[PDB]
Antibody
Framework: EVQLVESGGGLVQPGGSLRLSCAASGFTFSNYWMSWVRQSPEKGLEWVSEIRLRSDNYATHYAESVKGRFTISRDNSKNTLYLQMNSLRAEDTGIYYC?????????WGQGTLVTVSSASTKGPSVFPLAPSSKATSGGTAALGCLVKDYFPEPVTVSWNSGALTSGVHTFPAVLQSSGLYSLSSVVTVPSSSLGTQTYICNVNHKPSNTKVDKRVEPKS | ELQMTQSPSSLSASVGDRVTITCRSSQSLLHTYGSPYLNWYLQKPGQSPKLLIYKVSNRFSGVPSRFSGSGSGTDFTLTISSLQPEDFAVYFCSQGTHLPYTFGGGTKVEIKRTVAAPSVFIFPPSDEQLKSGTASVVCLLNNFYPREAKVQWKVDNALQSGNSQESVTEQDSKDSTYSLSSTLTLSKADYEKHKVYACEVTHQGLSSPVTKSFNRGE
C-alpha cells in the first residue's frame, strides 16, 4: 500500500522558516517524480513545486509565488521528500500535500497544516452545553461541549472516549472578533438516559497539547 | 500559464440526476501547448483529493461506473450519469502536464433532498464561563434542509444585531441534512443585566417561526 506521511508543519512566525518532510513507502520512491501542492480556502489548490529523477539531474520547478524562497529536495535512500520554506508569508498558510507522480496522475498524502501567524499557540477552556428541560424536543435531548478561544487549528472532540458516535455533530471552528478560534460539539440522546448515562466530551488540541475530559450533566 | 475555467462554482442536484461539470481554456491557451490531458478529482471535506479520471476520459481504477470524462480542444467535461448520496463533494480539474500546473476553481456539489425542518435547542452559559467574565449563549438547529435558515437572537424581546456567529456542518453523509450553531456572546455584565434569552428560527420547513427561550436563573 502506498503511503505518504507529511510532517514538520505547524505554527511559524511571519518571515521565519520551516522544513516539511514526506515519508514515502510501498513503492520504489526513486523511480517517480515527486511534488508538493497546497490548499487554502482563499486561493484553492495551488501547485507548489516538483522535483524529478536523478537521471534528470534532479530537475526542480516552482510556482512563481514561491520561487527563490522554497527548495524541494529528495533523499532516495530514505524515501523522503522535503520542502524547505524560508521567508514565509501570511499567504503561505495552508495545507501542504506531498505527492508522487505515477506516470499519468498523482497520488496524494493527507497533508499537513502550516500556519503563518504572529500568534502564539493557545489552548482552550471547555464549557458544558447543559441539557435542560424544555430545550429537548420529543423524548430527545441535546447536550454538548463548547471549546472557546484557541489557536491554531485543529481541535478534536470525541464523546465518551469514542464510544458515543451516533448523533454527534462537531461544527467547524469560527474565527472570533478576537483573533481566536471557537468550536462547539453537540450530540442528541434519549431524554430518559440523562440520569443514568454520564456524558463526557474528550477535547484534544494538539498544537498546545491540551487534553480535557469534561463531564456534561443536566442542570441542577 | 495554462489556466482552466471551471464551471459552475456550485450546484444542487437530486439523487439520480445527471450532473455535468466543465473546464475550459481559450483558443489561445490551446495553440500554446495543444489540447491537454486533464485529470478530474473529487475531495470530501478534511480528506485528500481522490482521482476520478485521468487523461480526459480514462476512469481510474476502483472508481464507480457512473463517473465519466470527455472533452475536445478547449472544453472538458466530467459527467455523473446518476448522482448518488455519497457524491456530495468539491470536484475539480487538474492541469498537471504543462508547467506551471494549475487547478480548476472547483464545483461544490450538494445533494438535493426533501425539505426538513430543524429541531431547536438552546443552552445557557455555564457557571464556569461566567466566572471568567464572558457569556456564550448557544442555539442549535439540528438536521434540516435546505441550508438557508434565519436565526434571530432576542434579549428581553430586543432583537440583537452584530453579536452573533453561526457555524454550519457540511451536508450529513447519512441523511443529507445540515445542522447549525449560532452563538451569541456577551460580557458577564450584559448577561446579568438582562433576563429573557431567546433565539427565533425561521426555515422553509416550519409553518411559523419557532422560538426557544430561557430566563436567567433556572
Amino acid at each position: 500500500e502506498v503511503q505518504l506521511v507529511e510532517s514538520g508543519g505547524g505554527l511559524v512566525q511571519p518571515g521565519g522558516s520551516l522544513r516539511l518532510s514526506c515519508a514515502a513507502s510501498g513503492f520504489t520512491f526513486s523511480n517517480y517524480w515527486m511534488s508538493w501542492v497546497r490548499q487554502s480556502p482563499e486561493k484553492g489548490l495551488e501547485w507548489v513545486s516538483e522535483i524529478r529523477l536523478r537521471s534528470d539531474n534532479y530537475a526542480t520547478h516552482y510556482a512563481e509565488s514561491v520561487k527563490g524562497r522554497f527548495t524541494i529536495s529528495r533523499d532516495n535512500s530514505k524515501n523522503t521528500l522535503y520542502l524547505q520554506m524560508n521567508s514565509l508569508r501570511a499567504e503561505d498558510t495552508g495545507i501542504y500535500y506531498c505527492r508522487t507522480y505515477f506516470y499519468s496522475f498523482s497520488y496524494w498524502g493527507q497533508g499537513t497544516l502550516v500556519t503563518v501567524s504572529s500568534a502564539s499557540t493557545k489552548g482552550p477552556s471547555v464549557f458544558p452545553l447543559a441539557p435542560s428541560s424544555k430545550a429537548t424536543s420529543g423524548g430527545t435531548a441535546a447536550l454538548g461541549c463548547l471549546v472557546k478561544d484557541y489557536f491554531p487549528e485543529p481541535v478534536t472532540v470525541s464523546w465518551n472516549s469514542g464510544a458515543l458516535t451516533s448523533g454527534v455533530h462537531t461544527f467547524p471552528a469560527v474565527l472570533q472578533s478576537s483573533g481566536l478560534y471557537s468550536l462547539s460539539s453537540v450530540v442528541t440522546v434519549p431524554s430518559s438516559s440523562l440520569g443514568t448515562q454520564t456524558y463526557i466530551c474528550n477535547v484534544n488540541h494538539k498544537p498546545s497539547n491540551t487534553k480535557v475530559d469534561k463531564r456534561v450533566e443536566p442542570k441542577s | 500559464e495554462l489556466q482552466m475555467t471551471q464551471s459552475p462554482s456550485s450546484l444542487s442536484a437530486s439523487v439520480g440526476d445527471r450532473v455535468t461539470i466543465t473546464c475550459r481554456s481559450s483558443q489561445s491557451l490551446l495553440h500554446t501547448y495543444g489540447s491537454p490531458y486533464l485529470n478530474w478529482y473529487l475531495q470530501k471535506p478534511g480528506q485528500s483529493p481522490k482521482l476520478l479520471i485521468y487523461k480526459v476520459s480514462n476512469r481510474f481504477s476502483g472508481v464507480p461506473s457512473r463517473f465519466s470524462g470527455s472533452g475536445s480542444g478547449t472544453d472538458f467535461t466530467l459527467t455523473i450519469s446518476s448522482l448518488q448520496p455519497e457524491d456530495f463533494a468539491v470536484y475539480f480539474c487538474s492541469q498537471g502536464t504543462h508547467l506551471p500546473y494549475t487547478f480548476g476553481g472547483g464545483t461544490k456539489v450538494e445533494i438535493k433532498r426533501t425539505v426538513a425542518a430543524p429541531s431547536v435547542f438552546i443552552f445557557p452559559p455555564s457557571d464556569e464561563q461566567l466566572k471568567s467574565g464572558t457569556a456564550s449563549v448557544v442555539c442549535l438547529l439540528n438536521n434540516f434542509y435546505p441550508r438557508e435558515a434565519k436565526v434571530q437572537w432576542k434579549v428581553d424581546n430586543a432583537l440583537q444585531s452584530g453579536n452573533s456567529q453561526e457555524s454550519v456542518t457540511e451536508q450529513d453523509s447519512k441523511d443529507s441534512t445540515y445542522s447549525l450553531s449560532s452563538t451569541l456572546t456577551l460580557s458577564k455584565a450584559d448577561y446579568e443585566k438582562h433576563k429573557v434569552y431567546a433565539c427565533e428560527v425561521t426555515h422553509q420547513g416550519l409553518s411559523s417561526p419557532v422560538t426557544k427561550s430561557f430566563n436567567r436563573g433556572e
